[PDB]
Design an enzyme around this catalytic site. Structure first.
Site, PDB file in Angstrom:
ATOM      1  N   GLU A  78       0.862  -1.169   0.000  1.00 12.41           N
ATOM      2  CA  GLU A  78       0.000   0.000   0.000  1.00 12.41           C
ATOM      3  C   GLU A  78       0.906   1.228   0.000  1.00 12.41           C
ATOM      4  O   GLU A  78       1.958   1.218   0.642  1.00 12.41           O
ATOM      5  CB  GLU A  78      -0.861   0.019   1.262  1.00 12.41           C
ATOM      6  CG  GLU A  78      -0.052   0.164   2.575  1.00 12.41           C
ATOM      7  CD  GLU A  78      -0.877   0.676   3.746  1.00 12.41           C
ATOM      8  OE1 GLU A  78      -1.929   1.319   3.517  1.00 12.41           O
ATOM      9  OE2 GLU A  78      -0.463   0.437   4.899  1.00 12.41           O
ATOM     10  N   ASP A 124      14.931  -2.693  13.839  1.00  8.81           N
ATOM     11  CA  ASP A 124      15.525  -1.557  13.148  1.00  8.81           C
ATOM     12  C   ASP A 124      14.528  -0.414  12.981  1.00  8.81           C
ATOM     13  O   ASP A 124      14.249   0.019  11.863  1.00  8.81           O
ATOM     14  CB  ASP A 124      16.095  -2.015  11.797  1.00  8.81           C
ATOM     15  CG  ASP A 124      16.923  -0.937  11.092  1.00  8.81           C
ATOM     16  OD1 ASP A 124      17.776  -0.273  11.742  1.00  8.81           O
ATOM     17  OD2 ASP A 124      16.723  -0.781   9.862  1.00  8.81           O
TER      18      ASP A 124
HETATM   19  C1  LIG Z   1      11.297   2.346   2.900  1.00  7.12           C
HETATM   20  C2  LIG Z   1      11.887   0.999   3.016  1.00  7.12           C
HETATM   21  N1  LIG Z   1      11.304  -0.140   2.812  1.00  7.12           N
HETATM   22  N2  LIG Z   1      10.014  -0.018   2.460  1.00  7.12           N
HETATM   23  N3  LIG Z   1       9.267  -1.108   2.215  1.00  7.12           N
HETATM   24  C3  LIG Z   1       8.069  -0.612   1.894  1.00  7.12           C
HETATM   25  C4  LIG Z   1       8.046   0.802   1.930  1.00  7.12           C
HETATM   26  C5  LIG Z   1       6.978   1.723   1.635  1.00  7.12           C
HETATM   27  C6  LIG Z   1       5.677   1.319   1.804  1.00  7.12           C
HETATM   28  C7  LIG Z   1       4.730   2.265   1.492  1.00  7.12           C
HETATM   29  N4  LIG Z   1       5.010   3.493   1.049  1.00  7.12           N
HETATM   30  C8  LIG Z   1       6.307   3.782   0.917  1.00  7.12           C
HETATM   31  N5  LIG Z   1       6.612   5.061   0.456  1.00  7.12           N
HETATM   32  C9  LIG Z   1       7.493   5.842   1.314  1.00  7.12           C
HETATM   33  C10 LIG Z   1       8.840   6.283   0.829  1.00  7.12           C
HETATM   34  C11 LIG Z   1       7.752   7.289   1.039  1.00  7.12           C
HETATM   35  N6  LIG Z   1       7.310   2.940   1.192  1.00  7.12           N
HETATM   36  C12 LIG Z   1       9.326   1.154   2.302  1.00  7.12           C
HETATM   37  C13 LIG Z   1      10.013   2.359   2.537  1.00  7.12           C
END
Ligand SMILES: c1cnn2ncc(-c3ccnc(NC4CC4)n3)c2c1
EC number: 2.7.11.22
Lengths: 295, 258
Positions: A78, A124
């Site tokens: 999402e 983390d």
């Molecule tokens: C950083 C590292 N690992 N990781 N996995 C899923 C996400 C995620 C999920 C949903 N939205 C977003 N967008 C964000 C960067 C603005 N990132 C995310 C962000």
């Protein structure tokens, strides 16, 4: 994979590249997490999927789909707009209002409580692994270093975890993790939203340890039974005095300090659990305000 | 901390039903017998020792293998490739620093190529629908040990051993959920070492009365007795060690007075 339109890069990191994407058929906006594929499927990707699949909660990122090809592996999340760090950087002049800091913390603690009561350590937590939307939500993200603790999780000898949000028990070389390390991280994040500055910004492990000491005092056997025995404790450690938390977090009410001191408790065994902190007086007046975010 | 232990138990208990292999799958597998599997699991115990892996890794590996076979027809010459991939996935999931794939290739006497092991890994993941966070007899013993008064390693080391033995023989130990095998394991270990029984607290925690454990506890006692005759002997060897308090050299009681 062909039903997805890439929109833009929205995240970086060693785990992989994160793109904002659109479902061409349903219209749903998502975050795609790309991993290239040579040691087979990365361990971090194996843990992240299998664990997120259990954890359906409003304050944990929703893993929507996992699409596996031969040469590539995409994790479909999402979409959330930006992370807490980017928001903090942006709130530098004006500050994050206390009603919102409380809101965030409250939700963070709810995400963590749900994790821990499903035997999952995040390990983390840092502002970049925490995602916020325009509507007031904040959600725990990145579960690549997350672990299931049906059996107690042994600590790595080369802690790949972030330096600034690291709990003292790790730095002092304890054998196992415990829910306490996730609470510590949040504590540090909570202080940071309040102070506009990182609470323990160490250079090395010993600089990180000393910084923790200069503020909260150098623990002894009274305050932390068995601290002296711990593998990376040294007799030649300086004995710093505990500082007044009103000088550490000036604009925080008594309860705020009460709570913060408890999340930053030394003994992992006495440190507050996420479950308990939710019942802490500080949250009696908790609301859900909207943040003012930028593109 | 205590606050989550209860929530975690009830969760694992819920999850063990979900992540559990079909009871009578071996009969539906037209080219593998219980024996063939016994030989595989025992080998994985050897692998576990060779690479100093947590026992939990083995326990997971076995659950993966079992669920895999629960829905895929597999030929005998490919069973080890199934066993290998599972041990690799279990290693990646559990271990701090997992062993290099090149090395899971190496322990099969190079029966399979590096490319074969990796393709199997991807197929195991597919069939298991990525759900690797399985409850194990080990995860359940860990929870039970907290209820000891006080902690007694010989008891733990025996329970571990007992519950590990259960992995080898699909007959009868597919009949029982991990939580039950663990409960049977614990009482039997405790009874052998200290003479005490399934404690009142654990009855309340688990809902399992000692009488409810009887069936499983009957089979486990038998496995313990016939342990030195069994065609698979890696675990007994493993648990002869001073580290595990040499529990596999402790004589089983002849009757359980149940
Ligand atoms: C950083 C590292 N690992 N990781 N996995 C899923 C996400 C995620 C999920 C949903 N939205 C977003 N967008 C964000 C960067 C603005 N990132 C995310 C962000």
């Amino acid at each position: 994979m062909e039903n997805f339109q890439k929109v833009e890069k929205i995240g970086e990191g060693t785990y992989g590249v994160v793109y904002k994407a659109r479902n061409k058929l349903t219209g749903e906006v998502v975050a795609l997490k790309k991993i290239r594929l040579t040691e087979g499927v990365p361990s971090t990707a194996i843990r992240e999927i299998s664990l997120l699949k259990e954890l359906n909660h409003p304050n944990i990122v929703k893993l929507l789909d996992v699409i596996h090809t031969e040469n590539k592996l995409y994790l479909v999340f999402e979409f959330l707009h930006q992370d807490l760090k980017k928001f903090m950087d942006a709130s530098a002049l004006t500050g994050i209002p206390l009603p919102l800091i409380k809101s965030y913390l409250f939700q963070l603690l709810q995400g963590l409580a749900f994790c821990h009561s499903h035997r999952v350590l995040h390990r983390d937590l840092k502002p970049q692994n925490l995602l916020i939307n325009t509507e007031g939500a904040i959600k725990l993200a990145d579960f690549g270093l997350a672990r299931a603790f049906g059996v107690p999780v042994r600590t790595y000898t080369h802690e790949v975890v972030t330096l600034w949000y690291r709990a003292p028990e790790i730095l002092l070389g304890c054998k196992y993790y415990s829910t306490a390390v996730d609470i510590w991280s949040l504590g540090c994040i909570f202080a940071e939203m309040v102070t506009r500055r990182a609470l323990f910004p160490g250079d090395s492990e010993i600089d990180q340890l000393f910084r923790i000491f200069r503020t909260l005092g150098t623990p002894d056997e009274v305050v932390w039974p068995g601290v002296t025995s711990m593998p990376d404790y040294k007799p030649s450690f300086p004995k710093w005095a505990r500082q007044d938390f009103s000088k550490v977090v000036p604009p925080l009410d008594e309860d705020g300090r009460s709570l913060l001191s408890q999340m930053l408790h030394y003994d992992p065994n006495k440190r507050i659990s996420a479950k308990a902190a939710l019942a802490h007086p500080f949250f009696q007046d908790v609301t859900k305000p909207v943040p003012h975010l930028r593109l | 901390v205590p606050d989550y232990h209860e929530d975690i138990h009830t969760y694992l208990r819920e999850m063990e039903v979900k992540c559990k292999p079909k009871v009578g799958y071996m009969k539906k597998q037209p080219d593998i017998t219980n024996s063939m599997r016994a030989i595989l699991v025992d080998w994985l115990v050897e692998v576990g020792e060779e690479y100093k892996l947590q026992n939990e890794t083995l326990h997971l590996a076995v659950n993966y293998i079992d669920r895999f076979l629960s829905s895929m027809s597999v030929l005998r010459g490919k069973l080890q490739l199934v066993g290998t991939a599972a041990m690799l996935l279990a290693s990646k999931f559990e271990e701090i620093y997992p062993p290099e794939v090149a090395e899971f290739v190496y322990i099969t006497d190079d029966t399979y190529t590096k490319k074969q092991v990796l393709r199997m890994e991807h197929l195991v993941l597919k069939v298991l629908t990525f759900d690797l966070a399985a409850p194990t007899v080990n995860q359940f013993l860990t929870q039970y040990f907290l209820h000891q008064q006080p902690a007694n390693c010989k008891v733990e080391s025996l329970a571990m051993f007992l519950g590990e033995l259960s992995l080898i023989d699909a007959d009868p130990y597919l009949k029982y959920l991990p939580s039950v095998i663990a409960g049977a394991a614990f009482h039997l270990a405790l009874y052998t070492v200290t003479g005490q029984s399934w404690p009142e607290s654990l009855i309340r925690k688990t809902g399992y009365t000692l009488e409810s454990l009887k069936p499983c506890l009957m089979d486990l006692h038998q496995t313990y007795l016939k342990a030195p005759q069994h065609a698979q002997q890696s675990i007994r060897e493993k648990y002869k060690n001073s580290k595990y308090h040499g529990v596999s050299l402790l004589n089983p009681p002849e009757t359980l007075n149940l």
